[PDB]
């Protein structure tokens, strides 16, 4: 839209005599536009524009005042001698009307630093108590920013902050309780007093409930001195107000870590609280869930199941379907795994691209996470190899192989061997590296290595350096571990492929010379099974968890 240089420059006239509220306000709008449209200010011109604007604060017009608040915050850090604007902001801030009140405190407090903290306090105390949400909330968020510059000034405001807390007005309360918790904190106990005061109350403020739930979620029994229960009579453990997010947050914490135990009018150990909200619209997403629950996610899992499972199967909408998979995943557990695996199998049919990779990873990942046998995990890992053939990667060769050598290795190599029949060079560097690494390392007597060798031999020709280099070194280790093997090593290595390419040659010259020429003290030593280059954890399963409902 605009050019940052021209607009930053023409702003310098304010610094002199011209104040023209219309022109300057426009020029300011343009600054906000340069940022908004996406541009970056030049520092000299910015510094100049900032000193100029402060003159403009003399003229009190509500649109010009507004421009001035956003522009000084954005230009504050890329400007010098900004301190002059504090006075002008205080002058504005005391002026009655929400346009000035709220927006000024926020602009002022952002620029304000511990020296300046003292100045804003009278005006701040007046602005915080307001049940007019703009002035009070802006002043409450403003105080949060100020805790950094100077803690002590902000702390004095705890009384005004508390005063706002008593509102049932959603903003004034959300901001008031949230801010207070941050402010008054010198020990757990004083914050806990602040929370108990509001705690017995059936708010109509969902945001306050939410911010507070978080403070509350841990068992607090020192709220306002002491009390005999972790009790929260505001939805956290109670269900005084129904509204699917608040209900979900509260229900997952309380069930197996009581914020209070179950009440007839407020389940808080029982699985119920989520579930009564569970059949719903788009809204259902919070409601349908789970997490924790008594004693497991599984009795819980059954309720909600109709909802999560029908959307997940039906909707090939990304937005719905994602909520449906996350919701299935949540109602899941060790038990649930039979059900979870069929659904996840089914899911890729709706969204099949990355989502395909993810379901074939998920079915394996779930089998590793939630035990349906380690073998089945390998069998799923074969299905992943089959379906994608390339969205397995390098980290997969290391993870599959390490995981495999817990039990599967003879089978895995063999499966891999079959899998290698796929596609000669589009199968990728990685599969060839897996059959190669596994055939090298196991040294098949489970199947004849000759199929494996014949399969790998073709793949190497037309695939990347790293695998061809891999293939010579593996062969060498394969030699040292099994005597039998040496004749195949020689036909393979003399070839222009497994040696005498580039990287492949260098490694080969070394690996070959050590096997061929040298004692093989070194070769022998080197093979301890013929293992991978690193043994990490089991990476796939967490990756897969986030990746599927994206």
């Amino acid at each position: 839209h605009l050019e940052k240089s021209a607009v930053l420059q023409e702003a310098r006239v304010f610094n002199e005599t011209p104040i023209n509220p219309r022109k300057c306000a426009h020029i300011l709008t343009k600054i906000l536009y340069l940022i908004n449209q996406g541009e970056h200010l030049g520092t000299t011109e910015a510094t100049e524009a900032f000193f100029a604007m402060t003159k403009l604060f003399q003229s009190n017009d509500p649109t010009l005042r507004r421009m001035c608040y956003l522009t000084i915050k954005e230009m504050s850090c890329i400007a010098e001698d900004v301190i002059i604007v504090t006075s002008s902001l205080t002058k504005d801030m005391t002026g009655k009307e929400d346009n000035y009140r709220g927006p000024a405190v926020r602009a002022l407090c952002q620029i304000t630093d511990s020296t300046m903290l003292q100045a804003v306090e009278r005006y701040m105390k007046q602005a915080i108590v307001d049940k007019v949400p703009s002035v009070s909330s802006s002043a409450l968020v403003s105080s949060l920013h100020l805790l950094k510059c100077s803690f002590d000034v902000v702390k004095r405001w705890v009384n005004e902050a508390q005063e706002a807390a008593s509102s049932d007005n959603i903003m004034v309360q959300y901001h008031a309780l949230g801010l207070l918790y941050h402010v008054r904190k010198n020990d757990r106990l004083a914050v806990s007093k602040m929370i108990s005061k509001f705690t017995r109350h059936g708010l109509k403020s969902p945001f306050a409930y939410c911010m507070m739930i978080r403070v509350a979620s841990k068992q607090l029994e020192e709220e306002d001195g002491s009390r005999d229960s972790p009790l929260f009579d505001f939805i956290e453990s109670c269900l005084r107000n129904k509204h699917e997010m608040v209900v979900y947050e509260a229900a997952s914490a309380i069930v197996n870590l009581p914020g209070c135990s179950a009440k007839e009018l407020a389940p808080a150990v029982s699985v119920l609280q989520l579930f009564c909200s569970s059949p719903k619209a788009a809204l259902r997403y919070a409601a349908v869930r789970t997490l924790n629950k008594v004693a497991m996610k599984h009795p819980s899992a059954v309720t909600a199941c109709n909802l999560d499972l029908e959307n997940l199967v039906t909707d090939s909408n990304r937005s719905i379907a994602t909520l449906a998979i996350t919701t299935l995943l949540k109602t899941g557990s060790e038990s649930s795994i039979d059900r979870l695996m069929k659904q996840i199998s089914s899911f890729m049919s709706e969204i099949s691209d990355e989502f395909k990779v993810v379901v074939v990873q998920a079915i394996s990942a779930l089998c590793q996470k939630y035990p349906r046998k380690h073998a089945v995990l390998m069998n799923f890992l074969f299905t992943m190899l089959r379906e994608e053939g390339g969205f397995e990667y390098k980290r997969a060769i290391v993870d599959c192989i390490i995981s495999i050598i817990e039990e599967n290795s003879e089978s895995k190599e063999t499966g891999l061997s079959h899998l290698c029949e796929f596609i000669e060079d589009c199968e990728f560097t990685v599969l060839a590296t897996r059959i190669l690494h596994l055939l090298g390392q196991e040294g098949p007597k489970t199947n004849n290595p000759s199929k494996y060798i014949r399969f790998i031999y073709n793949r190497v020709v037309l695939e990347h350096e790293e695998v061809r280099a891999g293939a010579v070194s593996a062969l060498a280790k394969f030699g040292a571990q099994n005597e039998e093997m040496l004749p195949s090593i020689l036909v393979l290595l003399k070839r222009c492929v497994m040696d005498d390419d580039n990287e492949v040659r260098d490694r080969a010259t070394f690996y070959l010379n050590v096997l061929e020429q040298k004692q093989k003290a070194l070769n022998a030593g080197y093979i301890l099974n013929g293992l991978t280059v690193s043994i990490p954890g089991l990476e796939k399963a967490l990756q897969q968890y986030t990746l599927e409902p994206s």
Partner: protein, 242 residues
């Protein structure tokens, strides 16, 4: 030509990447690399070409993009395996572009030249060390540095790390740990089979032509002759695709 070799070297000199003309250089790494290998295969074929190839290869390097050096270093290092202590001269040129780095290839190749060539030079702690504490992509770097870094003459270098510091380094880079060249970039090796261990065992006689890395480095795996694709690539890289 002589066979094909003579006129292929001339022809390759024109095609392969330089600082001379930027109508014959390109920042796509495989094509550049292939072109280095085609020029270089002529030497492997016929001797006369070795003498022509090495100075042209140094011009290839002079481009001084991370990648441009990289491709250059990768073939020339193969040529040295063929051409034992004949390309001593190149090492000093080859180090130069090793410092600005964003790729694997440059590290691999450079570490191999500088490594094999150590008797000739004495720079090596200084050159290697900027890279060893620099980043880019380093998987395959490990493999190539592992067999490579110590080599040739036991104590014939020194800048603040003699050839022995290099063997120390060479071992750390392979899979060990050691303060030397301000630590290596990575240690964890390339593709699963390769590992550190063979070379770690090795360097019986510390980076010296005997029966160590140096031996391997100054020798070429199997037969290497002609354009039968044994350290060769079979004519000029562009004609071959067809």
């Amino acid at each position: 030509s002589s066979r094909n070799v003579e006129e292929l070297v001339i022809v390759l000199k024109k095609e392969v990447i330089k600082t001379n003309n930027v109508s014959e250089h390109e920042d796509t790494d495989k094509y550049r690399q292939l072109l280095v290998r085609t020029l270089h295969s002529c030497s492997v074929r016929f001797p006369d070409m070795a003498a022509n190839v090495i100075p042209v290869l140094m011009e290839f390097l002079s481009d001084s993009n991370e990648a441009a050096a990289a491709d250059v270093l990768e073939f020339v290092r193969e040529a040295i395996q063929r051409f034992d202590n004949l390309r001593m001269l190149i090492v000093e040129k080859m180090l130069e572009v090793f410092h600005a780095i964003k790729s694997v290839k440059i590290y691999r190749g450079a570490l191999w030249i500088l490594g094999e060539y150590c008797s000739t030079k004495e720079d090596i702690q200084s050159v290697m060390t900027e890279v060893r504490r620099s980043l880019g992509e380093i998987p395959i770097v490990e493999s190539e540095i592992k067999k490579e870094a110590g080599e040739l003459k036991p104590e014939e270098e020194i800048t603040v790390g003699p050839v022995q510091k290099l063997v120390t380094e060479m071992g750390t880079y392979a899979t060990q740990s050691a303060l030397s060249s301000s630590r290596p970039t990575k240690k964890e090796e390339d593709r699963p089979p390769l590992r550190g261990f063979l070379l770690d065992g090795d360097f019986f006689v510390a980076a010296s032509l005997a029966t160590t890395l140096t031996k391997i480095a100054l020798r070429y795996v199997a037969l290497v002759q002609e354009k039968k694709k044994q350290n060769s690539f079979v004519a000029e890289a562009m004609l071959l695709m067809a």
